[PDB]
Design a protein around this ligand. Sequence first.
Ligand SMILES: O=C(O)CCCC(=O)O
Ligand SMILES: O=C(O)CCCC(=O)O
Ligand SMILES: O=C(O)CCCC(=O)O
Ligand SMILES: O=C(O)CCCC(=O)O
Ligand SMILES: [Fe+2]
Ligand SMILES: [Fe+2]
Ligand SMILES: [Fe+2]
Ligand SMILES: [Fe+2]
Lengths: 291, 291, 291, 291
Amino acid sequence: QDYSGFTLTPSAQSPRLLELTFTEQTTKQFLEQVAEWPVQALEYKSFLRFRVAKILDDLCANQLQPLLLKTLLNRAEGALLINAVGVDDVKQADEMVKLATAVAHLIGRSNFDAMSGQYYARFVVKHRVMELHNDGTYVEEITDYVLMMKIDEQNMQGGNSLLLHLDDWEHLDNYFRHPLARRPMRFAAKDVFHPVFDVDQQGRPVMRYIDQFVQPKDFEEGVWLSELSDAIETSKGILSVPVPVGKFLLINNLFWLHGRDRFTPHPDLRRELMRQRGYFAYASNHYQTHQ
Amino acid sequence: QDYSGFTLTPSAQSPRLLELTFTEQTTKQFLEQVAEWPVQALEYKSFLRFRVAKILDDLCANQLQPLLLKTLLNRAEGALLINAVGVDDVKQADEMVKLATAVAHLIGRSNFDAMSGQYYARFVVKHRVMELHNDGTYVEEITDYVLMMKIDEQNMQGGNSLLLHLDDWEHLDNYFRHPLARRPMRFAAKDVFHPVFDVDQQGRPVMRYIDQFVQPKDFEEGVWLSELSDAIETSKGILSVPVPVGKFLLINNLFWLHGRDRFTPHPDLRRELMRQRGYFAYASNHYQTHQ
Amino acid sequence: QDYSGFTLTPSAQSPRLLELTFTEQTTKQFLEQVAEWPVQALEYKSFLRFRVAKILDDLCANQLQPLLLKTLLNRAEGALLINAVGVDDVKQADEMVKLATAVAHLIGRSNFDAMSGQYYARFVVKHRVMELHNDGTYVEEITDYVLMMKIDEQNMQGGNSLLLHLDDWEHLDNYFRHPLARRPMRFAAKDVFHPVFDVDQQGRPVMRYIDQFVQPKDFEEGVWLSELSDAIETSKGILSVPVPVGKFLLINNLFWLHGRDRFTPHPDLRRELMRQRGYFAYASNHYQTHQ
Amino acid sequence: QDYSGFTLTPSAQSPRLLELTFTEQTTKQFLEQVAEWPVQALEYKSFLRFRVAKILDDLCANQLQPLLLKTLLNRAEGALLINAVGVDDVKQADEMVKLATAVAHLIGRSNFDAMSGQYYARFVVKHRVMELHNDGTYVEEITDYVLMMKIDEQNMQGGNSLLLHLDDWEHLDNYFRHPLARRPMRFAAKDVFHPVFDVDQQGRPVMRYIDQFVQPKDFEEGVWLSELSDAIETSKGILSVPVPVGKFLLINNLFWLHGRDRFTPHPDLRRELMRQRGYFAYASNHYQTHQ
Ligand SMILES: O=C(O)CCCC(=O)O
Ligand SMILES: O=C(O)CCCC(=O)O
Ligand SMILES: O=C(O)CCCC(=O)O
Ligand SMILES: O=C(O)CCCC(=O)O
Ligand SMILES: [Fe+2]
Ligand SMILES: [Fe+2]
Ligand SMILES: [Fe+2]
Ligand SMILES: [Fe+2]
């Protein structure tokens, strides 16, 4: 469908993953109206992350924020691949960070990243599969969204993002109905405890899993987790998604798992990524007390 | 008016800001009577900060402490620019620190400075505006006073101290009456929570704001804070105050915000500053219990 | 006796210490079936420690785990010296770690080692007695088992493992019946407090002692601890056990103490060790509440 | 008087300070019987500190411990200068540490020293007065004793230990009867709070004072502390005590303050000191409950 300032279309991998593209006109207006604040301004003054979010959404006739929220909160969807026409080269890395910042802070707030010391982190790669997982499993607070952007890509064969929506996982009911699915387990990167599975508000399964940080306490937990790992990694429901330079995935971390495919080692390989993770925060008609 | 040991006169920028000058006679007597304790003695033995405060006030026929307290506690004023005749060169930096220490510890105590590891900090600059703010917003305890002294100044164009008394801010009522004015927000440099506005004992607005450390949790808090920032930074009530070498500002941190103007980058630029921050502590007739 | 996949035989030092040897056939099958996961995979993904435990026990017709548990939990025994035919050279260090990992995680879980940052630690030596002690005395949680493996041994004269089963200690009753045996004392490597002696479920003495970390608070505690030390170190019940390359001791840390004999300083001496410590965890028929 | 293994005699500075000298026969027997444990053994295994204490006291026909306790606990005395005939050269530093360790652990236990990471600390000096103070004022637990030993002394003019018994301080009653004497104040090297004065079991004044770590909160506390400082530093009751190599002071930290006199800067100056601090612990007939 045609919205104000962007277009929206289902991906070739899955109707659950929608591709959102900001038009050139919208992109150049946004970059002009946020040229005043460099990325370092966003790092130091967090309210500016919300200011550039507003500018972007205002440029979309206030259609962007409700569309982002409806898509990410919809159990049937929950995943976007987002880009802006004309932003597609590593030389525009700062513009990429500004744009991703604006989109994220229309739907929530991005958390501190211990690896960068900022609300986002940039990584350079210069090659086996990264297994599917949820982020944020080793802290008490829930991470609702994962944002992963391709900043640069050179002589890169393979390395697609891997995605699995829990409602596409043919082994969901077998593992979810197991008693250990509800057992709180230790997670360590202070340790926290929570089960591998939980439920959303409607009783449907969500996951809080990563194989590196879950710490099975005994043989019973361990053997079950290793079968869970196999059952996830071999699932026929996994999506394999190219993420070209200037595109980013924005996914609901509760019922999507993500990872990364193997890629070819090449001497001149360069891949740059940018990540953000945070929680949802948005207005809705709902109950409160007092005045 | 003519006091004992010093003179007091309103500034050219504002009747709220008073200029206090210690006479040459008072200055040389003070420096003589405190020559026994170098600044390093004040760093190691905090009661000596109060000893040099007493010496200074005794040299003013005990008129200084009550004048300092009455001015800083007066909502109509709350700000002093203080100097001593004959102390005006970077070579007298230690004397400057002694004098500022004596003045501060007549009205309170200066807190530990994480940047220096001492009760004061000296910074050298060798250029855009520093936005108006209150100090101490990222800890639980209230900072009542900010003390900022010019130790050295070379080839410096611009860079005045910026000051804003809340009762000169034409947008006070619009932001203070907003519901978010009373919302406790997260501040981070352990995180603390408090609103951007509060009230003094008489119900009049005070502020605990800085754009770098306030952490809006969502789009609602963020957009409001960015408009607050604009409304402060563009206020026609801001004072632009030169602070010559050997002068220091001493302001009530609750209803004055402070910052620093842009200055010209110059290859041979040198500016040295000294800061102290602390809480008020003083005698008054008021109620207690027991014996 | 002849079990499935291994043999079991009493040691020459003591009927309490049993020697368990995996057959060549079992050893090569295990190494083949776990070749897919290098040691670094076990370091990062703890459930894999339980996966390789299962593979080993499945290769023993599920006779290994119950035998390990029955031996280690038996007060009359509680100690194993374990090896696999064909794994006996430092070049197979990784295979050694895999095998020891599999055995340990059939009976419990190995704890984080602050010296290595992993669930195990490797040390190289390149010479006086290490006194008998229990591990884990400076934390609140009980360490049930100590696993010590010889990875390499070159020009090594002496240095046997020293072992003492409390039921072989001729001074047990004299020290256990002393009031200070039940006095909680301070242990420090946050400090913890516990007595030097405790009891198992049947009222029989267990120990939580090491001379370096126990911190007697006064002359009374100190003199008694020094006599305890002498009484342990001179006990005629101590076993002196060679541990050849590829063998490991696996002992119940509650009623066995361990240490190390003096060895000859030699310029070309090389000794490599690997340790794991953890808690028991296993299935048994016992009571629970609720459903 | 003549005791078994040592002699005891009042000092030339004060009848409150007694000089205890171990005879040559006692000294050589002690060093022989503790030759088995080097100082590094005492650092690692704290009960050995009590073992060498016992050996020393046994060599004194068990007269040493009761004499040490009676002297240090006696309000009229509370201070010893201790030496052993034949131990008087820096080359015997380890022997000095052994001897001081044995004496201290007959009457208590020496605490961890953050400056050395051991139960004692050695410092080399290679020159103004160190003001009188009590140790341990910045932690919650009471330090009952300070032990200070001269390990080496070369081209040293001046630098006597300074001592003040509170019952020799002509200003005791004036400061003790002041309300601020009972005011808990902040001490910082987590901060602790306690008054400058307290009382012993009989209501007599004790002190917990040092000018560097006490943190007066305001002008009232500060001015009073500075007068207290003057009143202590100018007291005519201060003792000036040479401490030759191999001698150590052992004082009751509650009613003795200590410091150090000025000394002459000399290019070839070398002074080595060893300190221990701890709490009293000893047997006495007194009440308990239960069995
Ligand atoms: O993001 C997190 O907080 C946990 C997952 C880290 C990873 O991506 O491996
Ligand atoms: O002073 C503080 O404690 C907060 C403000 C720091 C600044 O001046 O930017
Ligand atoms: O293992 C531990 O946790 C304590 C003992 C350390 C040692 O082997 O000396
Ligand atoms: O010993 C302490 O714990 C406090 C005093 C330190 C000093 O001797 O200056
Ligand atoms: Fe991730
Ligand atoms: Fe400031
Ligand atoms: Fe051990
Ligand atoms: Fe001291």
